[PDB]
Swiss-Prot record:
The chain holds residues 700 to 1040 of 1040 of the full protein. It is found in: Nucleus. Binds constitutively to TP53BP1. Binds CDC27, which is itself a component of the anaphase promoting complex (APC). Binds PIAS1. May be required for DNA interstrand cross-link repair. Also required for checkpoint mediated cell cycle arrest in early prophase in response to mitotic spindle poisons. Possesses beta-lactamase activity, catalyzing the hydrolysis of penicillin G and nitrocefin. Exhibits no activity towards other beta-lactam antibiotic classes including cephalosporins (cefotaxime) and carbapenems (imipenem). Expressed in brain, heart, kidney, liver, pancreas, placenta and skeletal muscle. It comes from Homo sapiens (Human). This is DNA cross-link repair 1A protein. Belongs to the DNA repair metallo-beta-lactamase (DRMBL) family. Induction: During mitosis. The mRNA encoding this protein contains an internal ribosome entry site (IRES) in its 5'-UTR. This 5'-UTR generally suppresses translation while specifically promoting expression during mitosis, when cap-dependent translation may be impaired.
Amino acid sequence: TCPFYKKIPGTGFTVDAFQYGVVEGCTAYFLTHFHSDHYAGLSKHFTFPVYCSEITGNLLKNKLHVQEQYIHPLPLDTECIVNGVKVVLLDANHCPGAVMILFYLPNGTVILHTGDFRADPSMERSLLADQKVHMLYLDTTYCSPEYTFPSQQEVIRFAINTAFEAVTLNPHALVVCGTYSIGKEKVFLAIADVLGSKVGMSQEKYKTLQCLNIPEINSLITTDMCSSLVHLLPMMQINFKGLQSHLKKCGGKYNQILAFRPTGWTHSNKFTRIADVIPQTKGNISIYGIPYSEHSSYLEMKRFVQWLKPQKIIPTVNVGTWKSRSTMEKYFREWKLEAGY
Ligand code: NI
């Protein structure tokens, strides 16, 4: 049965609610982004209207095989009418195609559903600023003060400089980047651009990237592994055993690997600035863990919510336990007392 936090009150809308079969009373199903926990349940068997971004629509058609008749793509930053209700899609600064949804309810209430997002100050100068938002459905993945991370830009600068030095020292070195879903494409795109290379990958991953509306994509990516000095592999293969095996597959064209493992937060964010990062090394393989996040840090989330000043917050992440719900409610109350709303 569909949770209250996936329902938009006073409409027949749901958000990211595809795993419960037919939701009683739902006339439009919104999908914020193409990550499997959010799309879970969608397939060629789905026969109700799905509303989403153009990129998400491309992935639904080509990867999940949802029939075109049921896909309703909407443009960004544009006031649209769905089933008689005014809505706007905004860029979520998450993965490609990911949106936040603003609902203007018939009774005058305004609701923002963030989907998954990485809060940014640029959001404070969007359409959100034009009117009071009453209710916020919030991505609370990192809603605790221990969760700090660097900017995406600091992480990319470190990755570019690391890769350029290693390949200039050894022109027979290969660069490998781990992946398991869409998102974090700038890691491998920026490394390949500094090296003057295309990115090589499997046919299944190439198919995915070709759905993302990236300008000039045909000049950036290839299925011809031999021709390229940056390769993509499943995140599970970024270990010494997997990378040795891969080296053997490539036909001696390379004699060394430098690999990147973009993660979320892991315990050591607590001490270590990006400039101090050192890799784990075994013989001719070196692996760097890089904290490249597509979710808000605690400080980023707190800034956005204190700017927005909602009357109610509904969390959408870590809502399955009491302990977690209670801890989040304590931070919301602090934020509200500090900022006066
Ligand atoms: Ni996500």
